[PDB]
Design an enzyme around this catalytic site. Structure first.
Site, short mmCIF file in Angstrom:
data_model
loop_
_atom_site.label_atom_id
_atom_site.label_comp_id
_atom_site.label_asym_id
_atom_site.label_seq_id
_atom_site.Cartn_x
_atom_site.Cartn_y
_atom_site.Cartn_z
N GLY A 114 0.68 -1.58 -0.10
CA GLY A 114 0.29 -0.11 -0.01
C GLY A 114 0.68 1.25 0.30
O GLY A 114 0.14 2.41 0.65
N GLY A 115 2.06 1.08 -0.82
CA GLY A 115 2.83 2.58 -0.80
C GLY A 115 3.46 2.56 0.42
O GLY A 115 3.95 4.03 0.16
N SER A 196 4.29 -5.73 -2.79
CA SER A 196 4.65 -3.89 -4.21
C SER A 196 5.15 -3.64 -2.46
O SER A 196 5.99 -4.04 -1.93
CB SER A 196 2.94 -3.82 -3.40
OG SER A 196 3.12 -1.98 -4.84
N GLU A 323 2.42 -3.99 -14.26
CA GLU A 323 2.75 -2.86 -13.39
C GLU A 323 2.32 -1.79 -13.64
O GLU A 323 1.18 -0.41 -12.47
CB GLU A 323 3.96 -3.08 -12.95
CG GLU A 323 4.72 -4.15 -12.74
CD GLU A 323 3.71 -4.71 -11.03
OE1 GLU A 323 3.15 -4.47 -10.75
OE2 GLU A 323 4.34 -6.16 -11.13
N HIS A 436 -0.63 -4.50 -11.47
CA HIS A 436 -0.40 -4.26 -10.19
C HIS A 436 -1.56 -4.98 -8.99
O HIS A 436 -2.65 -4.20 -9.27
CB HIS A 436 -0.10 -2.99 -10.17
CG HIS A 436 0.54 -2.60 -9.21
ND1 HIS A 436 2.38 -3.29 -8.61
CD2 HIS A 436 0.46 -2.32 -7.38
CE1 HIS A 436 3.04 -3.22 -7.97
NE2 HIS A 436 1.91 -2.31 -6.98
C1 LIG Z 1 -2.65 1.21 -7.76
O1 LIG Z 1 -3.63 1.67 -7.68
C2 LIG Z 1 -4.99 1.10 -7.81
C3 LIG Z 1 -4.87 0.14 -7.22
C4 LIG Z 1 -5.38 -0.83 -8.16
C5 LIG Z 1 -4.13 -2.19 -7.17
C6 LIG Z 1 -3.67 -2.15 -5.77
N1 LIG Z 1 -3.96 -0.82 -5.16
C7 LIG Z 1 -4.50 -1.16 -3.89
C8 LIG Z 1 -3.13 -1.63 -3.44
N2 LIG Z 1 -1.47 -0.09 -3.46
C9 LIG Z 1 -0.93 0.02 -4.12
O2 LIG Z 1 -0.92 -1.11 -4.64
C10 LIG Z 1 0.08 0.79 -4.03
C11 LIG Z 1 1.09 0.83 -4.66
C12 LIG Z 1 1.95 2.69 -5.02
N3 LIG Z 1 3.06 2.81 -4.94
N4 LIG Z 1 3.52 3.56 -4.88
C13 LIG Z 1 5.10 3.70 -5.44
C14 LIG Z 1 5.19 4.63 -6.38
C15 LIG Z 1 4.32 5.74 -6.99
C16 LIG Z 1 3.80 6.87 -8.44
C17 LIG Z 1 3.99 5.16 -9.45
C18 LIG Z 1 5.20 4.27 -8.89
C19 LIG Z 1 4.62 3.69 -7.90
C20 LIG Z 1 2.86 3.97 -3.72
C21 LIG Z 1 1.66 3.45 -3.65
C22 LIG Z 1 0.48 2.91 -3.18
C23 LIG Z 1 -0.68 2.29 -3.75
O3 LIG Z 1 -1.91 1.92 -2.08
C24 LIG Z 1 -2.31 3.62 -2.62
C25 LIG Z 1 -2.57 4.68 -1.55
C26 LIG Z 1 -3.46 5.38 -1.91
C27 LIG Z 1 -4.11 5.53 -2.23
F1 LIG Z 1 -5.16 5.99 -2.89
C28 LIG Z 1 -4.24 4.63 -3.69
C29 LIG Z 1 -3.41 3.20 -3.66
F2 LIG Z 1 -3.14 2.35 -4.95
C30 LIG Z 1 -5.36 -0.10 -5.73
#
Ligand SMILES: COC[C@@H]1CCCN(CCNC(=O)c2cc3nn(CC4CCCCC4)cc3cc2Oc2ccc(F)cc2F)C1
Ligand SMILES: *[C@@H]1O[C@H](CO[C@@H]2O[C@@H](C)[C@@H](O)[C@@H](O)[C@@H]2O)[C@@H](O[C@@H]2O[C@H](CO)[C@@H](O)[C@H](O)[C@H]2NC(C)=O)[C@H](O)[C@H]1NC(C)=O
Ligand SMILES: *[C@@H]1O[C@H](CO[C@@H]2O[C@@H](C)[C@@H](O)[C@@H](O)[C@@H]2O)[C@@H](O[C@@H]2O[C@H](CO)[C@@H](O)[C@H](O)[C@H]2NC(C)=O)[C@H](O)[C@H]1NC(C)=O
Ligand SMILES: *[C@@H]1O[C@H](CO[C@@H]2O[C@@H](C)[C@@H](O)[C@@H](O)[C@@H]2O)[C@@H](O)[C@H](O)[C@H]1NC(C)=O
Ligand SMILES: *[C@@H]1O[C@H](CO)[C@@H](O)[C@H](O)[C@H]1NC(C)=O
Ligand SMILES: *[C@@H]1O[C@H](CO)[C@@H](O)[C@H](O)[C@H]1NC(C)=O
Ligand SMILES: *[C@@H]1O[C@H](CO)[C@@H](O)[C@H](O)[C@H]1NC(C)=O
Ligand SMILES: [Cl-]
Ligand SMILES: [Cl-]
Ligand SMILES: [Cl-]
Length: 527
Positions: A114-115, A196, A323, A436
C-alpha cells in the site's frame, strides 16, 4: 470450542466451512502494547500477559491511514480500502490453521502492500482460509503502522527513530516464533510473502540482522527494497519530518520537544498534513517510508545487496505484465478509467513530468527517446502504452529483476515469474491489462471458489499457483510435480530464465525487459 494457550494468555477461535472441510481462524490476536500516547512514534513494546480468554473472533482495527477516495462507489479501488475501523490501536494479527490441527505445518506470513501509507490485513483478497484448507499450511498476517505514524524519522532519536512499521512486522514474526507451535505450526519452516510495499518489506527483512532468525524463505510479488520509491534518504526523512511539524504548528528547536508536540495532535491532523510534506512528489508519493535507521537497517541497502550482506536462503520473485497502468489514472494528464485513454506526444511528455518530478530535462528526454522509437508511429495507443511501460519498468519490474540477479550471485536458488493473466472479473478498463496487485487473489486461491464467477481455466491457474507457492514454502522449490507441469528453473545471472504464469501454456523465457532494464539500471541512475 477451540482455545489455544499462548505465551501471553488463552485465545479462542472460530470454525469455518471451506470446500466441505473446516478451517480454524483466529482473527485479531494482539501482538504488542497499543502504540498510543507516549508510545506513538516509538518502536512496538512487548505485550503484558492476560488471564482471560481473548476472543479472536473478528478482524481488529486497521491502522490509521488516508483512504483512496479517487473513485467513489467503484469496486476496483474501494476493495483495497480498509474494511475495519481505523485506530492507532491496530497491532493485531490473524492465524488460519487447518482442521484437524496440523502436527508440524509450514507457516506462511503475509505482509500487505500500500505504498507504506495504506493497507490492512483484513482485506478479503488476503483471506488465508483457502490456503490452510487446500495446502494444510498455516497462514498468518499482521497489521503494521503505515504513514507518518509508522515511518516518521528523526534518525538517532528513539522518540521517533523511523521504521516503526518494519519493527511492527518484526515483532509479529517473533510472536510466531514463540507461539505458532501451540497452533500446530513449525517455527523452523516460516516463509514470508508480500506484495508491493509488502514485498519491499520482505526484502528488507532479508537484510535486517534482527529478522535473520525469524523466518526461513521469502517470496516477493511486485516489489523490492531497491525500487526507487521504497527507501527514504536521511535528508528527505528529516526535511519531511520538519515539514510535517511546521504544517501542524509543532516545529520547535529541541527535537524531542517536536515529538512531544506531535504526540498531542490527533491522528487526523497528522493524516491530513502527510500529503504536503513533499514539495513536488509523484502521485501516491511515499511520504513516510523505510529509512536507514542504524537499527533495523545498518547501511544503505544497495550496499548490503551489492556486497552479499543478507540472509542466505531461497527466494521466489515476480512481477505482472502491466505494473504501471494502474498508477496512470492517479494524475497523468489524458488518462481515465472510463475511456481508452489515447494520449498525444505532448500528453506523454506531461506524464513524464508527473512521474519524474525532480528529474532534469535531459533525463526526461532520455526516457522519451528510449520508449518512443515505434514499431509503427501510426498506432494511436503508442504513447498510452509507453507511459504505462515507463512507470512499470522503472518502479517495479527492473528493480525486481536487479534484486534477483544480485541476490542469486551469492549462490542461492532464486525463481522468477512473469504473471500475465488478466482476471476475467476485472472491473478496470481493458487498456490497463494485467494490473498491479491482481495476481494476489490467484495466490490466495480465490478462484478455487466455484461460486465466485471465475472461469474454469482461472481455477486451474490458481490451483497450480497455490501448489507452487506452497511447495516453495515447504521445500524451497516452486514445482508442481504431479500434473505434467513445466519445471520452473532457477534464475541465474548468466541465463536469467523465468516462468510465465497464464491460463494457457506456461513457458520458460530468458532476460525479461533486457533493453529496457539496461536503460533504467545502468544509464538512468547517473542522471
Ligand atoms: C494502484 O492504484 C490502484 C490500485 C489497484 C491495485 C492495487 N492498489 C491497492 C494496493 N495499493 C498499491 O498497490 C499502492 C502502490 C504504490 N506504489 N507507490 C510508489 C510509486 C508511486 C508512483 C508510481 C509507481 C509507484 C505508492 C503506492 C500506493 C499504493 O496504495 C494506494 C494508496 C492510496 C491510494 F489512494 C491508492 C493506492 F493505490 C489499488
Ligand atoms: C525541504 O522542505 C522545504 C519546505 O517547504 C515546504 O513546502 C510546502 C509545500 C509545505 O510542505 C511546507 O511545510 C514546507 O515549507 C522546501 O522548500 C520549498 O522548495 C521548493 C523547491 O524546492 C520551493 O518552490 C518552495 O518555495 C520552498 N518553500 C518554502 C516554504 O521554503 C525545500 O525545497 C525542501 N528541500 C528539498 C531539497 O526538497
Ligand atoms: C478521457 O477522459 C479524460 C478525463 O476526462 C473526464 O472523464 C471522462 C470520462 C468524461 O466524463 C470527461 O468529461 C471528464 O472530463 C479526458 O481528459 C480531459 O480532457 C478535457 C477536455 O478535452 C481537458 O480539459 C481535461 O483537462 C482532461 N482531463 C484530464 C484528467 O486529462 C480525455 O480527453 C478523454 N480522452 C478520450 C480519448 O476519450
Ligand atoms: C518439526 O520439524 C522440525 C524440523 O523442520 C524441518 O527442518 C527445518 C530446518 C526446515 O527446513 C523445515 O522446512 C523442515 O520441515 C524438527 O526439528 C522439530 O522437532 C519438529 N517438531 C515436531 C514434529 O513437533
Ligand atoms: C467470548 O465468547 C463467549 C461466547 O461464545 C462469551 O462467553 C465470552 O464472554 C466472550 N468474551 C468476551 C466478550 O470478552
Ligand atoms: C531536549 O529535551 C529533552 C526532554 O526534556 C531533554 O532530555 C534533552 O536533554 C533536551 N536537549 C536539548 C539539547 O535541549
Ligand atoms: C491436477 O490435475 C487435476 C485434474 O487432472 C486437478 O483437479 C488438480 O487440481 C490438479 N492439481 C494441481 C496441484 O494443479
Ligand atoms: Cl482515528
Ligand atoms: Cl509520433
Ligand atoms: Cl542481457
Amino acid at each position: 470450542d477451540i482455545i489455544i494457550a499462548t505465551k501471553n494468555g488463552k485465545v479462542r477461535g472460530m470454525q469455518l466451512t471451506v470446500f466441505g472441510g473446516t478451517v480454524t481462524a483466529f482473527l485479531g490476536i494482539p501482538y504488542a502494547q497499543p502504540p498510543l500516547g507516549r508510545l506513538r512514534f516509538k518502536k512496538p513494546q512487548s505485550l503484558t500477559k492476560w488471564s482471560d480468554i481473548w476472543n479472536a473472533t473478528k478482524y481488529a482495527n486497521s491502522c490509521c491511514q488516508n483512504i483512496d477516495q479517487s473513485f467513489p462507489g467503484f469496486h476496483g479501488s474501494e476493495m483495497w480500502n480498509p474494511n475495519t475501523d481505523l485506530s492507532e490501536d491496530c497491532l493485531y494479527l490473524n492465524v488460519w490453521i487447518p482442521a484437524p490441527k496440523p502436527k508440524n505445518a509450514t507457516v506462511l506470513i503475509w505482509i500487505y502492500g500500500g505504498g507504506f501509507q495504506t493497507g490492512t490485513s483484513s482485506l478479503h483478497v488476503y483471506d488465508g482460509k483457502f490456503l490452510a484448507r487446500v495446502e494444510r499450511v498455516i497462514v498468518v498476517s499482521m497489521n503494521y503502522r503505515v504513514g507518518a505514524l509508522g515511518f516518521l524519522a528523526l534518525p538517532g532519536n528513539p522518540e521517533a527513530p523511523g521504521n516503526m512499521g518494519l519493527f511492527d512486522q518484526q515483532l509479529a514474526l517473533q510472536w510466531v516464533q514463540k507461539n505458532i507451535a501451540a497452533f500446530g505450526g513449525n517455527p523452523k519452516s516460516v516463509t514470508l510473502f508480500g506484495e508491493s510495499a509488502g514485498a519491499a518489506s520482505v526484502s528488507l527483512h532479508l537484510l535486517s540482522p534482527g529478522s535473520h532468525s525469524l523466518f526461513t524463505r521469502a517470496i516477493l510479488q511486485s516489489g523490492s527494497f531497491n525500487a526507487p520509491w521504497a527507501v527514504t534518504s536521511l535528508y528527505e526523512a528529516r526535511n519531511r519530518t520538519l515539514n510535517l511539524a511546521k504544517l501542524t504548528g509543532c516545529s520547535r528547536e529541541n527535537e524531542t520537544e517536536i515529538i512531544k508536540c506531535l504526540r498531542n495532535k490527533d491522528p487526523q491532523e497528522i493524516l491530513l498534513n502527510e500529503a504536503f510534506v513533499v514539495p513536488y512528489g509523484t502521485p501516491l508519493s511515499v511520504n513516510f517510508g523505510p529509512t536507514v535507521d542504524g537499527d533495523f537497517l545498518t547501511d544503505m541497502p544497495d550496499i548490503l545487496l551489492e556486497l552479499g550482506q543478507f540472509k542466505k536462503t531461497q527466494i521466489l520473485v515476480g512481477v505482472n505484465k502491466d505494473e504501471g497502468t494502474a498508477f496512470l489514472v492517479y494524475g497523468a494528464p489524458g488518462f481515465s478509467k472510463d475511456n481508452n485513454s489515447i494520449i498525444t506526444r505532448k500528453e506523454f511528455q506531461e506524464g513524464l513530468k508527473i512521474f519524474f518530478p525532480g528529474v532534469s530535462e535531459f533525463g526526461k528526454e532520455s526516457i522519451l527517446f528510449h520508449y518512443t522509437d515505434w514499431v509503427d508511429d501510426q498506432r494511436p495507443e503508442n504513447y498510452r502504452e509507453a507511459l504505462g511501460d515507463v512507470v512499470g519498468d522503472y518502479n517495479f519490474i527492473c528493480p525486481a529483476l536487479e534484486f534477483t540477479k544480485k541476490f542469486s550471485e551469492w549462490g542461492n536458488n532464486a525463481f522468477f515469474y512473469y504473471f500475465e493473466h488478466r482476471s476475467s472479473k476485472l472491473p478496470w478498463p481493458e487498456w490497463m491489462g494485467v494490473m498491479h496487485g491482481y495476481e494476489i487473489e490467484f495466490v490466495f486461491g480465490l478462484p478455487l471458489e466455484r461460486r465466485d464467477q471465475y472461469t474454469k481455466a482461472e481455477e486451474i491457474l490458481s490451483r497450480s499457483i497455490v501448489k507452487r507457492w506452497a511447495n516453495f514454502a515447504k521445500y524451497g522449490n516452486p514445482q508442481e510435480t504431479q500434473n505434467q507441469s513445466t519445471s520452473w528453473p532457477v534464475f541465474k545471472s548468466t541465463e536469467q530464465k523465468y516462468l510465465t504464469l497464464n491460463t494457457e501454456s506456461t513457458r520458460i523465457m530468458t532476460k525479461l525487459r533486457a533493453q529496457q532494464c539496461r536503460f533504467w539500471t545502468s544509464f538512468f541512475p547517473k542522471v
